[PDB]
Amino acid sequence: NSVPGAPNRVSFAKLREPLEV
Amino acid sequence: GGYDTPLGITNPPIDELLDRVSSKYALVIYAAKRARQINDYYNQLGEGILEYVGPLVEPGLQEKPLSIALREIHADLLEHTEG
Amino acid sequence: RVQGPREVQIHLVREVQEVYRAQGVSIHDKHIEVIVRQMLRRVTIIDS
Amino acid sequence: MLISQRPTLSEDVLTDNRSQFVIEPLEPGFGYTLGNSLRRTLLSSIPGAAVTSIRIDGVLHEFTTVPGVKEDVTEIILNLKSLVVSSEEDEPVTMYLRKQGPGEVTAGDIVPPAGVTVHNPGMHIATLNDKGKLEVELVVERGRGYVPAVQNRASGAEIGRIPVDSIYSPVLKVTYKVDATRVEQRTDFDKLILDVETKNSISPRDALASAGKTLVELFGLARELNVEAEGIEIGPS
Amino acid sequence: LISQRPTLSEDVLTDNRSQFVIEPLEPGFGYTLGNSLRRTLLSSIPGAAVTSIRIDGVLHEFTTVPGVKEDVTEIILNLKSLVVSSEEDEPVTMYLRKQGPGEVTAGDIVPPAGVTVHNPGMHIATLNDKGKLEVELVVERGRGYVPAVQNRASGAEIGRIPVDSIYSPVLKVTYKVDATRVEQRTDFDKLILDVETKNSISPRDALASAGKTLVELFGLARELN
Amino acid sequence: NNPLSGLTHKRRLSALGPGGLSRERAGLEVRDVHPSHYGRMCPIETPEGPNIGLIGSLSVYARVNPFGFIETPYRKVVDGVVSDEIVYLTADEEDRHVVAQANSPIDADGRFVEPRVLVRRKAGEVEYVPSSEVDYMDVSPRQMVSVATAMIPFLEHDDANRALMGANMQRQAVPLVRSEAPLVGTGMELRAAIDAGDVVVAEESGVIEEVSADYITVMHDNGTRRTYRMRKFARSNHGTCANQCPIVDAGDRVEAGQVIADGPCTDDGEMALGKNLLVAIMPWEGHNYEDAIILSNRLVEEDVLTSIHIEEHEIDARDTKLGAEEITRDIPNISDEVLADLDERGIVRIGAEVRDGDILVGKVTPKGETELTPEERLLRAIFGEKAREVRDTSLKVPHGESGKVIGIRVFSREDEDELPAGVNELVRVYVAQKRKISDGDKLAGRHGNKGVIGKILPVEDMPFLADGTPVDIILNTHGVPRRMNIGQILETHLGWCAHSGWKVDAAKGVPDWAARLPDELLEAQPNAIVSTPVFDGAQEAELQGLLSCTLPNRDGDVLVDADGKAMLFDGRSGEPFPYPVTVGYMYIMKLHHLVDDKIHARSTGPYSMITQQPLGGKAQFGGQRFGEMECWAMQAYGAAYTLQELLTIKSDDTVGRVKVYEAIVKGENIPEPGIPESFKVLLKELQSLCLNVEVLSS
Amino acid sequence: WLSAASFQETTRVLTDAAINCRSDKLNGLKENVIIGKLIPAGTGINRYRNIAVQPTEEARAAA
Amino acid sequence: QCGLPKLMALELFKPFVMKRLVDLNHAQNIKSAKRMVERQRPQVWDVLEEVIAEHPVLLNRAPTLHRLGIQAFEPMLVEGKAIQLHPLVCEAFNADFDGDQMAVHLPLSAEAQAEARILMLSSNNILSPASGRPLAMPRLDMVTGLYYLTTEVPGDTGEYQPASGDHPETGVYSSPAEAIMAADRGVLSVRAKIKVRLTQLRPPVEIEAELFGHSGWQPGDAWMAETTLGRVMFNELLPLGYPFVNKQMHKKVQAAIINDLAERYPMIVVAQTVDKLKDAGFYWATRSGVTVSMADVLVPPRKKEILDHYEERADKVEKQFQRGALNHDERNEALVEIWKEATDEVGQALREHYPDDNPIITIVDSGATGNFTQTRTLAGMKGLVTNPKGEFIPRPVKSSFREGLTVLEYFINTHGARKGLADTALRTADSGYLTRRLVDVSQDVIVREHDCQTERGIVVELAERAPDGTLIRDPYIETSAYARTLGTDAVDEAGNVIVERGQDLGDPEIDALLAAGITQVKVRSVLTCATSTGVCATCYGRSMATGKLVDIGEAVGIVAAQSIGEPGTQLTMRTDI
Ligand SMILES: [Mg+2]
Ligand SMILES: [Zn+2]
Description:
- The structure is cut from a larger assembly and holds two copies of chain A, one copy of chain B, three copies of chain C and two copies of chain D.
- Chain A is largely without helices or strands.
- Chain A is 0% helix and 10% strand.
- Chain A is built from no helices and one strand.
- Chain B contains three helices and one strand, in the order H-H-H-E.
- Chain B starts with 13 loop residues before the first helix and ends with a strand.
- By secondary structure, chain D is α+β, with helices and mostly antiparallel strands.
- In chain D, 19% of the residues lie in helices and 35% in strands.
- In chain D, the strands form five sheets. Chain D has a four-stranded antiparallel sheet with strand order 1-2-14-13. A four-stranded antiparallel sheet of chain D has the order 5-9-3-11, covered by helices on one side.
- Chain D starts with 7 loop residues before the first strand and ends in a 14-residue tail after the last helix.
- At the F-H interface, helix 3, helix 7, helix 9, helix 10 and helix 11 of F face helix 1, helix 2, strand 5, helix 6 and helix 7 of H.
- Magnesium ion binds next to loops of chain H.
- Zinc ion is lined by residues 452, 454, 528-531, 536, 539 of chain H.
- Chain H: Belongs to the RNA polymerase beta' chain family.
- Chain H: The RNAP catalytic core consists of 2 alpha, 1 beta, 1 beta' and 1 omega subunit. When a sigma factor is associated with the core the holoenzyme is formed, which can initiate transcription.
């Protein structure tokens, strides 16, 4: 998320992004 | 003639018409000229009638002259001279 | 020029038919025969 | 309320017992509702009678052929199955048919007492030959629907009896088809055409009449919730 | 084999859901009987629904009202799910009167005699201190759904806003069967049918109306004799 | 036509223009995908027409170096340890180093379990390399992908062609009236919606003072306030609505960088280009034959798929030697029922419905003078009609559109505006209509499955589950295996799982498939939202496990079995279908290829100046072009007369045109075709080109 | 020369035809298409174009 | 028939409805009729529907490859704004419902209407003019439906099994009516082997000759058929005189059936029967239960072992390449061969693992669509991925689209995908240019006279003899020897005349030639036609579009050039000839 108004989107990601787009 | 009855645009079977003529193009010219004659007779009804005679078969309610032309060919009511 | 006009028609027709049938496409020979007859219409002049 | 167009029935006789029924016009979307219900009701709602079990002389274990006659037994059992009969009584009545010497076997040589009639006397059943002798015993009862062969409970008592499938429905085959004629002008109305073919004992006309009459009876029980409710009415006849 | 005439019981689960049992049927009839009931019970049940709306502050349905939090088409969409029942076929009008901040619900609407809003707890929009909501409703009986008629085809005012109307008290419907298939040939079907209505009419009433329509449509065929 | 199209219009790379190469100049070498494009330029987002391979789109992580070179970041690894230092490398810089797999078995210290890891070398060769030898590793998956093509779930299962096509239709979606968030999507949707710019973002935090449809005023933390003027039903550049609805309350504190009001294709601040619909992958009576789709009329009734279309019409009132053009009601020879919805100022009343041919703006113009027919002189004495010396050069609503009127933006020189020279008044009227879904409209998912609407049939005539819920959409099964787009059924299964919800029974130990599956996923609520990155997403085993646990809705009913299919009853016959059919929820969006904008017919319109052939295009009356290839088929049949009529009297011969019109108004036989005028014009060009050309009778 | 003109290298064939005073027969299919005359194929040949159609005498008697 | 939007027809038939409505007194005057029609008042719709009756219209889809690209239909008014196109002529137009558009042209003259009604009617042109194969064949969905209908699964419900002692066979049915009555209940499935006494269906030739004798007329006489009632319904579609088939229905089998029907039955009959086939196929495609899902897409258990074995071989060859004994060229070639063998092994393993009744399987073997290579690409492992230059990458893909791909695998696959999609756009334009050149070069070849009476002709190999001693039929006969005319008389060993000169040389004639043992024949072709202008009709031979002798004025040159130029989009090169 990391966005104040972000709806909770559960994701099947296996690894964490070192940086955001 | 065991084929079941046709419908729509193919009310006269194409093959039965084709046996009447030598080739397909001759049949097309057959139909076109007969439809033209039908239209001229329709336009000459009120005024002086030319040598043209209208539908030798019974006409329906409102059918385009080509349809009556084909029905006339199907009844062997016309003969033609090949060019 | 070495096998007359008869053999070249056979060669051309068989070659184009093989090319077209390589992809499983069926075309009858007469269609290409018309064209190859069209090519062989003219003859060159070698004497005045 | 009204559908603004009184639907009509058109019946076109084709053979002695074969007809085409047309429902024109019809409220949109109702074509299938009427067609499937009508075809199922015709197939499995009209009372009728058919043969159920078969016993013939000379057979106790030979389910292939019978002496006296030359042809096999499957032809005989199928021909017996394809027999029309109208019975006004519910008990299984026994049939017989016998003759001496070579000849042609037809249903006209059957011996039907009062209460049962056969409408196909001129139907070939077998070809007796070689000074043959046969004695065919039939069991026929009435009902409705289509039911397969039912095993003989008294196999010991009736070892020559053989079960067979039965065609209780007087109607043979029904097919329906819908189309979209005159949809735009009369608000999506459609024709529903029915093809009906029944046995020669009865006719498609009264067959469909009785089918609809049965359907309306069994549906008035569903109607009997609010006697005065709101629906749609047809009009005159 | 069974020679017994079919019956029809009733099984009520909630105030809008019911289970219907028709016993005994004939093997293979239950599916088609359920389908035939369901199609007409879903698409041929007369009902009442809103047709046109009018707002004194707007001229058409693409302009926001000063004070309302939603936009005009949002109020159209919200009141599209209203539950209104009437008994007379003549069109009738309704009225909405709400002032100041606060939620506006169907319970705020004051309907005339013969019109009952069965869903008063449904909210329509929300206001503020500048809330000025003067909303006109019209309701007529009908069947099926009808797309929005053109306000120029009929002699209607400029401010009149047509709305798509759907007259269908039935919400959801399903059927299930379970035949016996006994070796003794005692075969019959047991049709269990379910009806769920939109709190306008009880499932019993919708089933009765559908049955009446089918009875007439089949007595159409019965008269052939 | 949607925020995604705006996003991808920027951040896209073209190859045409001044100094570039044209399509004919472009060989096969340019259109390819060079291995150096990895991470720099996405190899998917590309127009599929003649411009294939020339116009592309930038990747999501790419950056422009100060010199104009496209530059991408990458993690650096040393001795089997990957640091968090992020360096930026150009294309040629990657030659010297070795970049590793985006998804590699990191052990939470940087070492990879096996030495040989799939890496990309200098010359584009992909070979195995020991772990201690690699020096760089990719930032993350979806680094070689574009923003538009990062929204496709299960991208790694779709073929490159179908993924390309789906990325293309992503830009062509139209804004609906609800814009429901997709049940299954990718994490890029939120960022794309926020960065599109048409979703208003609260720049500074604080509580909300007051909210309203037309405006929102946020109360900051320090004294001053900020008001955000909203845009309602703003016409877009492609005739699509741009509604902007707020999604906050009266007194809820907001945070800087938070969404405030949703854009045309957004809800709750994330991308929403379509809707979630029940799907049946079975064929149905051939109405879905060959990529056709059949939808439920519920979508028409419930307004599930409907889009507003704002249309703008302009009229110019310039200066002429007739005097001036007045915007009044004094239009000669007009009735009343057509003038009832037009105000006394020369324009339409705001909120009056119009259709084709209706009068829109009354621009009276002095007619001038020509040969007044004698018949007019006789006619004026039979009814007393005045001369009516002005030509009614008004605004007629063109064919094939209708709807209500939004508003009037009127400009005038009397209003003291900067109108062009000679132009006195400029009036722009806006017309809007609610376009329902209908047959012929193009629908498509996100995996590239396209197709027009074969039939809109009522809810009774559809398969329905044991729950009695009618299906929503129906797709043909033949299109799935023959197009390598297997990802769509995976998305369908995941959508059904999200719609139903699941509770993995991790009571007797965690299931093996769920072990790698993260936390907070073993439990889910009905109609929840899940995300799946394009290349790091849910595996097949995870989907199998989700399908295994499919807790029912309200009763006890597992409609979808473990394998994924489901039982459906026919709505027409009523008997159950002999075999189960897979059901689920797939994202479906309307495309901007509506049948209304693509229907055209012409009986007799205008003709060009040089040749008397008709014009082309829907802007004018048009008229279909009969190319010479169609003439070849004409000749092949041998239908000589039909070709003669087409080329002579339906196209060219003026006298033939008027004569044939007279023929099929008098009911008289159609006369012989004449000599085409275009041939005479060619003859004249040859004659005037210093070529003596003469046609010889005998 | 008309067919060659409308096929490829219009200027070259036009120049060479003009030099040679090449008079076209206007009998080919493409030329008849350009002029608008009936093509010499299908229903365009003289055998079919000049077909005379009149009713049979028995049919005339039936009226 | 063909659909036509109501507004489209209203605008197309403008003057017709004006004259009709004024004739009906709808508008006293035509000036009134202007606004009468443009306001679209309700009275225009019925008067419009009156004038469409039996007025044919033309339909066209760009581009027009072959002669069948333009077809004439008799339209009915349909609500909406889309043209309702019949699902059978999609092959002719090459039309797909992705969103492709079609243009409609309205014939005007009486002559033009006659030509549209006769030559261009969609029913009158079924056979492809290119090769003579039926082009109005049932396509994907109906092929799947018929394949499901006429398949015969053993061990099904209600099968026929011989028995004695306690119960009869209980598998024989009196009439198809009783068969469908049983099938309405659950007792009997459609695809179960049964025995039925048939009456209205002609038995096969062998059974007819054996039982019915010389007089083998079917509807009167009853006979016993051992088949499945689904095949009975399928046979019911065909005309009465057609013999029973009792065979499973692939694309090629229906092609043969329709070809024979067109050969020995009137055109209207086949035009009706193909429609009946379409209806039945569409109806039975729904119940076929062909549906794709994760369960249907299975992976081979043996895939891991085969992949590991070929990976070990690849490791050995890579170590060999490192030693330097073999150059990089040998490395790439050996890797390519090893991986091609690996993917062949994976393909055959997948073929042996998939059940014969799997949805993808019944799709692929029914011939409706797809090929087994595409299935292997779906489940298993794709194979070798190409390069932008055209080479094969030494390190190929290993997973499948069902198992998912990693980023660089997707990159390399994108290479080839983009290459192919760029090549297609150039190849279509090149094919168009080739068609233009062919049409221009062959414009003047038109049949002029019936026969030139010449004796010059060509010779066709026609099934050269085998060393073992037999008549091995030539693989290429229908394109070379069929639909011809004999330049001389076919006589064997100076004996009887099997086929005299001047014969259509149909299938019975070729069968007689093969039976007689003859191999070499002379053919009267166009290459030796003695006509000064054009070609004589006999030299050209049978016309594939009509199935009869070519007419006296058909433009054979244009039809040819179109037939050669049409399949130009399907031409693909191999991996300096
Ligand atoms: Mg297409
Ligand atoms: Zn010759």
